[PDB]
């Protein structure tokens, strides 16, 4: 491409996601494909477990499996770190702490390869309970949380974020998952370092009735907010 930063996102952009994971002695891989339309904050993706049965619940991987597709209101476009890092991209790292259970540690590189926005991820699970909500596959196949709270990390020329996800459990209880996130640019060039704000996400998890592989279909709408 000729284009840089926000100019890369003005139409519909193809997305490719590749994840390698290891949790509870089970190595697995996930591939995803779809498209993103940042003008409307809209993402449509289908994910497939390419190694057989996914050893963790699909809802626990949603946040790991491209915040560059967020709709930033015109008055907030100076605060969009994620697009400003493109096409060279950014590293996104998280620790996701499942309350009274284990943790995910994730590292991803998000960048353009030609026309396609690619998210390549490694995930490691730490100290999960075999009888717990995650390894028991006790989570409902839905989603209920929305906000990601962003702050600048100027010393690293990037951002941090923190937010709690609530996963509904089949018995009516909830499993909390506290996300700590850091993003840093891959390249040497400038980025937009934002004032405090948040991303609000609306979602929908579904299934493809013709797909025999373990999979997840995702529709998401994401909008930046919290400044005037």
Author numbering: 0 to 64, 68 to 230
What does the paper say about this structure?
The examples shown in the Methods section ascertain that SeU can be successfully and conveniently used as a practical and easily applicable vehicle for phasing novel crystal structures of macromolecules by the SAD (or MAD) approach through the anomalous signal of selenium. The use of SeU as a provider of anomalous signal for the SAD phasing has been examined on crystals of several proteins and a nucleic acid.
The two amide groups of SeU may serve as donors in hydrogen bonds formed with various acceptors, such as carbonyl or carboxyl functions of various amino acids, hydroxyl groups of Thr and Tyr residues or suitable atoms of nucleic acids. On the other hand, the Se atom in the central selenocarbonyl moiety of SeU may accept hydrogen bonds from various donors, provided by amides, hydroxyl groups and protonated amines.
